[PDB]
Design a protein around this ligand. Structure first.
Ligand code: MG
Ligand code: MG
Lengths: 94, 140, 120, 41, 68, 55, 53
């Protein structure tokens, strides 16, 4: 008897949904977690002039390692051993 | 007509030996059979997932039954066993419910006493002794 | 139009009642953040996804240490709705070389340097 | 040389144990199967 | 105080039941390989991984959640 | 056209080209075709080097 | 597929491991060929590992 015109959750006329107690409690829980995040972000340790250059050496050496790998990309070696072990496929007993 | 296929019988036989126990033309006609063995295998994987879920639901139902036979409710039993630090899972809890009713009655009595101790602490709201079975064993 | 959000310094100024609600000393601030992602980056903007990847919180419920410095704080301020932030407490100090293989983080956010698996 | 000593140790070279140099024979891609069939690229 | 005394009486009397041997066919609930097994004597269990042990080898299961 | 210990040749080429680069040069040693490839243009330096060693 | 395959319960041969463990393998028959390139690895197994086993 009761039809929502078209699709239920899109359009001008939508099927109504109502907020439940557990949904409200879930949102309140996430809000509390974020208020605590606001507090722990509100207290900083250092300032910008104090942190201006404290990790430049480590960042530079990490990028130098990345450069070293990207430069060291290169084909691998080949072996007389490997070719002559492919010779072994005809190794009979007697 | 060089390079013809000669083991098509064996490929068809693989699909049909997986399709043998079906009903209708889909146990012997290769096209209808191969359209159904695929669905059987996909159902097998998704039913591994459904199997784990259904076994957990069955254990929960049996624990609810036995606890209600002891007058205790399932959330009370589970939460108070957790508070008493007895970490028996739902499988062995249902197993003890079915086969070992005296041990299950002991567990239900422990959970009910822990619930009563929690109620007493909540109503006291002060610094009374914590309770004999409400003591927390600490590890370090 | 939906854009990025500029968040006030007024909500990031703390207050005394906030201090006793979440006990934390304004002088002598805590040194390290324990950051843990508790929300998906799906149905979220690409910049938030990128900043999650930068901070290293791709796996949910996997805690990560970060510096309590203003740049890291700015990144966490952008992505603050997908994470939980705790102070890293050290009851018996920083780990040393002889106790580095017996550590545990614990749910209280206290990195103990000695772990026995024995009752107290 | 050492390679010739290995040849002395190893079985006989015939037409049954010959191999191309790896990397010289790129495999043929043909339109069969799921990946290379259907619309066939 | 009276409850701790009653606990001492019950724990003691159960201990001399153990000393005398007024029991038979014990069971245990044992944690093993992320599972909890309700096992008894002369029992069989199937673990879903290799165990780095030779066949027919005696070991001791230790993480006993429950015995009775 | 290298006969013999091409690995010894590789070691000599690496310790000769390391001061000119700072880092160890990137090389491939092919023992089947007795050849050695270095990543970079070092033709004149290697020619003068092999001259002064005597090849 | 479980529905199209046989099934059984967990069991031992003769209550194995109760009094003593008895190895349930009795015989191993190795059909190997002298000149088979397919049988090369089995030939190496017979040369080196079957005595220790
Ligand atoms: Mg409609
Ligand atoms: Mg098709």
């Amino acid at each position: 008897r009761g039809r929502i015109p078209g699709r239920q959750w899109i359009g001008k006329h939508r099927r109504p949904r109502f907020v439940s107690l557990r949904a409200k409690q879930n949102m309140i829980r996430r809000l509390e977690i974020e208020a605590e995040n606001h507090y722990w972000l509100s207290m900083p340790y250092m300032t910008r002039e104090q942190e201006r250059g404290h990790a430049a050496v480590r960042r530079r050496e990490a990028f130098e390692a990345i450069k070293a790998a990207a430069t060291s990309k290169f084909p691998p070696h080949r072996f007389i051993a490997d070719q002559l072990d492919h010779l072994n496929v005809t190794k009979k007993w007697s | 007509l060089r390079n013809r296929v000669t083991d098509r019988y064996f490929r068809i036989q693989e699909v049909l030996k997986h399709a043998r126990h079906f009903r209708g033309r889909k146990n012997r006609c290769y096209r209808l059979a191969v359209r159904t063995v695929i669905r059987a295998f996909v159902k097998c994987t998704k039913a591994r997932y459904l199997k784990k879920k259904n076994m957990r639901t069955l254990w929960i139902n049996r624990i609810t039954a036995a606890s209600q036979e002891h007058g205790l409710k399932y959330p009370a039993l589970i939460g108070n066993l957790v508070k008493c630090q007895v970490e028996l899972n739902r499988k062995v809890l249902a197993d003890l419910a079915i086969y070992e009713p005296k041990t299950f009655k002991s567990l239900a009595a422990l959970a009910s006493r822990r619930r009563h101790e929690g109620f007493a602490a909540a109503l006291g709201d002060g610094k009374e002794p914590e309770g004999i079975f409400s003591r927390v064993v600490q590890y370090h | 139009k939906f854009t990025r959000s500029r968040i006030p310094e007024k909500v990031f100024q703390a207050s005394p009642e906030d201090h006793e609600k979440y006990g934390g000393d304004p002088q002598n601030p805590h040194k390290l953040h324990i950051v843990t992602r508790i929300k998906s980056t799906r149905r979220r903007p690409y910049w938030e996804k990128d900043i999650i990847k930068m901070l290293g919180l791709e796996k949910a419920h996997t805690p990560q240490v970060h510096k309590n410095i203003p740049s890291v704080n700015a990144k966490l301020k952008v992505v603050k709705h997908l994470i939980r932030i705790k102070p890293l407490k050290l009851p018996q100090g920083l780990p040393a070389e002889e106790n580095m293989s017996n550590t545990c983080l614990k749910s209280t956010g206290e990195l103990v340097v000695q772990w026995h698996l024995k009752p107290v | 040389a050492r390679a010739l000593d290995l040849l002395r140790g190893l079985p006989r070279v015939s037409l049954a144990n010959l191999k191309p140099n790896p990397g010289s024979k790129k495999p043929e891609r043909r339109p069969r199967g799921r990946r290379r069939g259907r619309k066939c690229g | 105080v009276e409850e701790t005394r009653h606990h001492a009486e019950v724990v003691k009397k159960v201990n001399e039941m153990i000393v005398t041997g007024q029991y038979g066919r014990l069971f245990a609930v044992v944690h093993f390989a992320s599972r909890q097994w309700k096992v008894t004597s002369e029992d069989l269990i199937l673990i879903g991984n290799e165990l780095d042990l030779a066949c027919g080898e005696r070991i001791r299961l230790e993480k006993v959640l429950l015995v009775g | 056209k290298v006969e013999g210990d091409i690995w010894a040749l590789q070691k000599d080429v690496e310790d000769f080209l390391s001061p000119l680069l700072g880092k160890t040069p990137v090389t491939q040693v092919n023992e089947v075709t007795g050849t050695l490839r270095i990543k970079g243009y070092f033709d004149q330096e290697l020619k003068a080097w092999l001259l002064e060693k005597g090849f | 597929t479980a529905r199209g395959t046989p099934s059984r319960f967990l069991a031992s041969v003769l209550h194995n491991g109760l009094g003593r463990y008895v190895q349930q393998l009795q015989r191993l028959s190795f059909s190997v060929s002298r000149d088979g390139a397919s049988s090369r690895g089995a030939r190496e197994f017979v040369e080196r590992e079957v005595i220790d086993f």
